[PDB]
Design a protein around this ligand. Structure first.
Ligand SMILES: COc1ccccc1C(=O)O
Lengths: 1051, 244
């Protein structure tokens, strides 16, 4: 009567992942087995053709193995046909399938990635041993470099040889005024872009003065000595270095004059370290500008620097030693060709479709430029399904000269209306050459939240996966290799079309893009242009406004910021128009980077436009602001038409100039190396970076080697050792971590979250598997700095095989920006954008925040013994218990400041709904969210105008906001909080363009939450950009009011 | 009539999503324009401003559009307004609302099926290539062992013919043992590769089969979705979220 006695006949409980952990798999130490047996048999192939099979330990070095092999081969035949062992080097096939010579004989048998447990012995062929340490580069990259040498494609090979231009130029800048310039590469100053101090920071400073602490070391080393100065915030490291040496060497035996002389000799032998990490203060900036200082001031902390001798620094920095790699007709202008474009389709081959279900199938086509220059067309619905073939010439209504440089054919096979496969080709090659002949294109499947027929934004070029729908085709061939015009030629045709327009006459019906106004335009026009200028990138422009812009294209040079709008008004199918645009863009006023990144998204594919945008960055974008937005600039590379371009040459160079950038530039590229839409491109790029970054390669190699071990470790825990007790697992973990290969590979290296921190010697006592079913590891390390004690003695970060970090990675980045926006406008909401870093396919790292707890923990600790009901006040009680005295008042301010910001950030981004097990409170009272989930409202694809409030302030929070009141909604404490939320919400609304653009640039990545621009459009409604800002506030008040049911209706 | 009008920003683009070439509708800052003709053309929406007595001589919003339903837009500026765009006709309110719950449970089941199969598909893609790489690695492994049984014969059968009486079968038998191991190992290796290739085909067959059913699910996933949206469109002419 429950179920109307209805049987579900099919349902079987004999094993039916619903009943965590979704990616997998990735084989480890030997083919098909995660961890090789602790003792194993290895077949040693000798020069004399004998196969002696040694039992070796898993962890044994090739020195050890060889040393014993040349004992045990004596007992075999033909011993006198072998040279001394030192005349030999091991070699074998790896899991990457490449015969790898084993030079570093200190390596262990497990760490070789070996496929079959066997080792051939040879004398080292190719005498040039050092350059066969591309092994280092191929390890760093995780594909062998020889996999490139045997790629046919000229572009690839052209990229590798030409990109060295950029490498050589960087390495030049490095050893310019060495060693200082070297030290500057490695240890660049970590500084804000602004020297101006926010008003709230200055007020903490005792009218512009900090108390600092310089520490020094004398003999033998051990004893250190404080020298607590009280200097001006805006004085430089040199000045501070002197004031320490002064106080150090004042004396009852030295006159005042005798000090001055002993200071000068001493002063410039020293530089300022930060105690506890490898940050330095290497150039003239206001101390307050260095990030460490400004954080110390915010946290009520007294800076702890160390005087370090320049020679003990330049002791550590080894030479970069850059070496060049072993890889060291006339034509017909497009505009001559007088025919419309036609493209011959031929045969798809491998199309997998149910002929029962699906009627008939065709090929849709179109030309594109982000948006399309003509009518989209198909072919007829022929040889449907049962072996599909159409031998048609499709005819496109555009003349071949009116093709823009950046034009690309998009195509797709469809059903009857539903897309099967897709793939897009560049209509010109990287050498400017109009494509002509026969082309083999293997296709890509449509992704998850993609309903549309065709996929223009998707990546250009063929799938490299063979066994996929290979839809071949043919391009019209005009007896000659047709090329795109020179600039000289386009300038001429621009200047012609210019003067041609001057003689056009009186009326024009659809003058529309002809002015008729002359040099004198009306005042209402010049107002409607700055009106447009300001509108965000997603407020699509009307055809009126487009032609309106396109007419007054020349007055648009007065309002540079209009350019992104202007460009989307050009008709790219009229080379008359396009040529003229190429001449405005030639000498357009450069603009702010925040605006100029719009121009490297998918909707601005032209080379000249994208050049201008890089020219902007080259001028304005600082190394600080670069690493703020590096995620987005690396992502934006996918929309570049060809391997070799200006954006790549910019970033590669920045990477090779500043090693903090370099570090993250490696990891973000390496992050995406699994994804074959980029594996070639990024591989090639990563090769270049690695070949030129000098000694950081060797550092990166340790980091990589450490992550690989951890990946394997968790791969084992999440298979086979599932369905075992945490008890049993943790035995297995520690057992494993103790083995020498792990001890080697996991102990001395740099945090990938921040290579400033060193990691040495893991404390295995505090290392453990967290409770989650994804089996995240909680790892702990000794801070091996000389001054560990002054910063943290223990360094600890969580490694999580199983979850795709890159949504987290981005939201935290967005938060980080909202903070800096807010703070550098003078208003102190304190967000905690904790560190996150994806290093692979659902693999990454999360910074631990010591002394912080999920609200749920608070309430489980503070709740009464007789499990009845948890108290609203326990949060407050737990908080009071921490902060007592004048301290109490300040903790509430902080909770209220953070809680205010997170309220607004959360709402605007639409992040996953908040509740007790994903909100966190720190001992000092700051609140901050974690585990954000899907950002722009991605449960909305089910049903969805939900304009959600995800941070819904329960009683708990409200109590705490209004000290400890009853009916909290009515205190001035809360009035304050509300106004924080209102002045926060607006301040972001003023930078809405940026946030749109940042989200726009991330469409590249295959994040499901960012498939196309209307995903991004959630952020419009929630910031309320179609309204006036007075309305927007009222929208936000309303929106906030209904989630809490009362509180929000005064101003 | 002007308020009803049949056809009369983000959700405009969603109503435009996946309609054919020609489809349209009319939209409403007042200090900007008045109305807006959104018109879909080949996978790109095209926005046209409406300036308001005259909306120049056309005396209404309904006036100007009926004129361009028959005709192209080319003569005003260098396609027509062809497409001005069931539910079991249930004049029920409550019973159209349970269908909304049920089509949503059909849809949301259907999406799981499509979401599951995409993992199966992609894991299968990877696992296949892992095999292909492994086959190359096998083949390479094999070649080094083939090269070995070659390598021995040369230096082996130099030390058969020099001397012969010295050692003789105490020499050559223990040389011939080594060789017998060498080739029957290659025997195993080659079989290990074969045995991988067969699995590749069975994998690749299932690879095709996943896609085959993915593609069959897709078109009905759209119509299930499309009928659901028209159902929830019919109702709306805060109560919804429990069904959904
Ligand atoms: C040409 O139309 C667009 C321009 C920018 C972003 C999206 C679109 C669209 O296809 O609707």
């Amino acid at each position: 009567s429950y179920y109307h006695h209805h049987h579900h006949h099919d349902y079987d409980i004999p094993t039916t992942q619903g009943a965590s952990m979704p990616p997998r798999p990735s084989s480890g130490e030997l083919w098909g087995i995660h961890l090789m047996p602790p003792r194993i048999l290895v077949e040693c192939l000798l020069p004399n053709g004998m196969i002696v099979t040694l039992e070796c330990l898993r962890e044994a070095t090739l020195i050890t193995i060889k040393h014993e092999l040349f004992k045990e081969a004596r007992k075999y035949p033909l011993h006198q046909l072998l040279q001394d062992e030192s005349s030999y080097i091991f070699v074998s096939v790896t899991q990457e399938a490449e015969r790898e010579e084993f030079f570093d004989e200190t390596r262990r048998l497990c760490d070789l990635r070996l496929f079959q447990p066997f080792l051939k012995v040879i004398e080292p062929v190719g005498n040039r041993e050092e350059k066969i340490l591309n092994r280092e580069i191929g390890f760093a990259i995780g594909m062998p470099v020889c996999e490139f040498d045997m790629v046919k494609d000229p572009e690839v090979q052209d990229f590798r040889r030409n990109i060295l231009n950029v490498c050589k130029e960087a390495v030049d800048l490095r050893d310019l005024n060495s060693p200082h310039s070297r030290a500057m590469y490695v240890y660049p100053p970590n500084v804000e872009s602004s020297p101006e101090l926010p008003k709230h920071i200055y007020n903490k400073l005792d009218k512009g003065q900090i108390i600092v602490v310089i520490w020094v070391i004398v003999s033998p080393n051990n004893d250190k000595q404080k020298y607590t100065l009280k200097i001006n915030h805006d004085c430089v490291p040199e000045q501070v270095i002197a004031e320490a040496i002064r106080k150090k060497t004042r004396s009852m035996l030295l006159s005042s004059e005798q000090l001055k002389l002993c200071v000068l000799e001493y002063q410039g032998k020293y530089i300022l370290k930060v105690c506890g990490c490898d940050e330095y203060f290497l150039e003239k900036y206001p101390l307050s500008q260095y990030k460490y200082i400004r954080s110390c001031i915010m946290l009520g902390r007294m800076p702890n620097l160390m005087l370090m001798a320049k020679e003990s620094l330049y002791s550590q920095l080894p030479m970069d030693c850059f070496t060049m790699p072993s890889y060291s007709t006339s034509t017909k202008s497009l505009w001559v060709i007088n025919s419309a474009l036609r493209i011959k389709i031929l045969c798809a081959t491998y199309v997998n479709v149910n002929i029962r279900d699906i009627d008939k199938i065709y090929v849709r086509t179109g030309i594109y430029h982000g948006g399309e220059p003509l009518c989209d067309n198909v072919n007829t619905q022929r040889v449907p399904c049962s072996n599909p073939r159409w031998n048609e010439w499709l005819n496109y209504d555009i003349y071949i000269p009116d093709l823009p440089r950046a034009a690309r054919l998009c195509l797709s096979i469809c059903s009857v209306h539903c897309p099967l496969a897709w793939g897009n080709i560049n209509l010109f090659d990287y050498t400017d050459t109009l494509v002509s002949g026969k082309m083999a294109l293997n296709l890509w499947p449509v992704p998850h939240g993609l309903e549309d027929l065709l996929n223009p934004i998707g990546v250009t070029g063929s799938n490299p996966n063979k066994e996929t729908p290979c839809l071949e085709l043919e391009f019209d061939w005009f007896s000659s290799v047709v090329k795109f015009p020179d600039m000289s030629v386009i300038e001429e045709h621009a200047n012609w079309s210019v003067s041609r327009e001057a003689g056009f006459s009186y009326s024009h019906a659809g003058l529309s893009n002809r002015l008729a106004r002359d040099n004198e335009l009306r005042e209402n026009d010049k107002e409607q242009l700055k009106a447009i200028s300001t509108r965000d990138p997603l407020s699509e422009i009307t055809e009126q406004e487009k032609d309106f812009l396109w007419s007054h294209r020349h007055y648009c040079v007065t309002i540079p910021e209009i350019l992104p709008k202007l460009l989307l008004s050009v008709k790219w199918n009229s080379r008359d128009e396009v040529a003229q645009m190429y001449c405005l863009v030639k000498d357009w006023p450069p603009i702010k980077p925040e605006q100029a990144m719009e121009l490297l998204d998918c909707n601005y594919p032209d080379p000249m436009v994208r050049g201008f945008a890089v020219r902007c960055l080259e001028k304005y974008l600082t190394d600080d602001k670069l690493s703020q937005y590096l995620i987005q600039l690396v992502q934006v590379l996918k929309y570049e038409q060809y391997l070799d371009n200006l954006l790549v040459r910019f970033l590669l160079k920045k990477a090779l100039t500043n090693q903090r950038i370099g570090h993250f530039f490696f990891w973000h590229l390496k992050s995406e190396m699994h994804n074959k839409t980029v594996s070639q491109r990024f591989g090639l790029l990563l090769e270049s970076y690695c070949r030129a970054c000098g000694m950081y390669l060797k550092h990166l190699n340790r980091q990589v080697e450490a992550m690989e071990k951890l990946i394997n470790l968790t791969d084992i825990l999440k298979q086979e050792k599932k369905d075992e007790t945490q008890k049993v697992q943790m035995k297995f973990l520690v057992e494993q971590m103790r083995r020498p290969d792990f001890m080697d590979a996991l102990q001395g290296f740099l945090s990938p979250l921040n290579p400033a921190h060193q990691l040495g010697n893991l404390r295995l006592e505090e290392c453990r598997i967290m409770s989650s079913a994804k089996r995240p590891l909680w790892l702990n390390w000794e801070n091996p700095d000389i001054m560990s004690e002054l910063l943290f003695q223990n360094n600890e970060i969580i490694f999580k095989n199983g979850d795709d970090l890159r949504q987290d990675m981005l939201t935290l980045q967005i938060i980080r920006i909202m903070e800096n926006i807010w703070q550098n406008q003078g208003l102190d909401l304190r967000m905690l954008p904790y560190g996150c870093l994806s290093i692979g396919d659902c693999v990454g790292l999360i910074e631990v925040v010591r002394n912080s707890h999920t609200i749920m923990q608070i309430q489980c600790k503070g709740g009464l013994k007789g499990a009845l009901q948890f108290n609203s006040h326990t949060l407050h009680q737990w908080l009071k218990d921490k902060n007592k005295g004048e301290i109490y008042d300040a903790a509430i301010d902080l909770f209220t400041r953070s809680c205010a910001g997170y309220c607004v950030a959360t709402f605007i981004l639409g992040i996953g709904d908040r509740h007790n097990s994903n909100i966190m409170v720190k001992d000092d009272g700051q609140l901050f969210h974690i585990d954000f989930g899907h950002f722009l409202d991605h449960k909305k694809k089910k049903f969805g105008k939900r304009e959600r409030v995800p941070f819904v302030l329960t009683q708990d929070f409200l109590i705490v906001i209004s000290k400890g009141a009853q009916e909290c909604t009515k205190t001035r404490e809360f009035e304050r909080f509300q106004e924080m939320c209102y002045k926060a919400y607006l301040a972001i609304r003023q930078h809405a363009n940026l946030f749109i653009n940042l989200f726009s640039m991330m469409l590249g990545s295959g994040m499901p939450e960012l498939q196309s621009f209307d995903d991004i459009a959630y952020i419009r409604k929630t910031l309320a950009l179609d309204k006036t800002e007075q309305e927007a506030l009222e929208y936000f008040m309303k929106q906030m009011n209904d989630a809490h049911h009362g509180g929000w209706t005064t101003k | 009539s002007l308020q009803d009008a049949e056809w009369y920003r983000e959700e405009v683009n969603e109503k435009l999503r996946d309609t054919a070439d020609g489809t349209f509708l009319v939209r409403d800052t007042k200090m900007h324009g008045d109305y807006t003709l959104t018109l879909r053309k080949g996978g790109n929406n095209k926005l046209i401003k409406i300036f308001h007595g005259k909306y120049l001589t056309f005396s209404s919003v309904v006036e100007l559009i009926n004129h361009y339903r028959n005709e192209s837009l080319a003569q005003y500026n260098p396609v027509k307004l062809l497409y001005p765009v069931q539910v079991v006709k249930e004049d029920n309110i409550e019973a159209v609302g349970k269908k909304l719950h049920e089509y949503n449970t059909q849809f949301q089941e259907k999406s799981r099926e499509y979401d599951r199969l995409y993992e199966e598909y992609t894991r299968t893609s990877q696992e296949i290539q892992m095999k292909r790489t492994a086959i190359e690695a096998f083949n390479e492994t094999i070649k080094i062992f083939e090269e070995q049984c070659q390598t021995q014969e040369r230096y082996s059968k130099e030390y058969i013919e020099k001397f012969k009486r010295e050692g003789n079968e105490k020499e050559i038998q223990r040389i011939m043992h080594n060789y017998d191991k060498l080739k029957s190992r290659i025997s195993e290796i080659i079989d290990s590769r074969r045995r991988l290739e067969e699995d590749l085909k069975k994998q690749a067959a299932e690879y095709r089969e996943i896609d085959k059913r993915m593609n069959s699910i897709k078109p009905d996933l759209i119509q299930l979705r499309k009928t659901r949206d028209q159902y929830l469109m019919w109702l709306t002419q805060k109560k919804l979220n429990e069904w959904l």
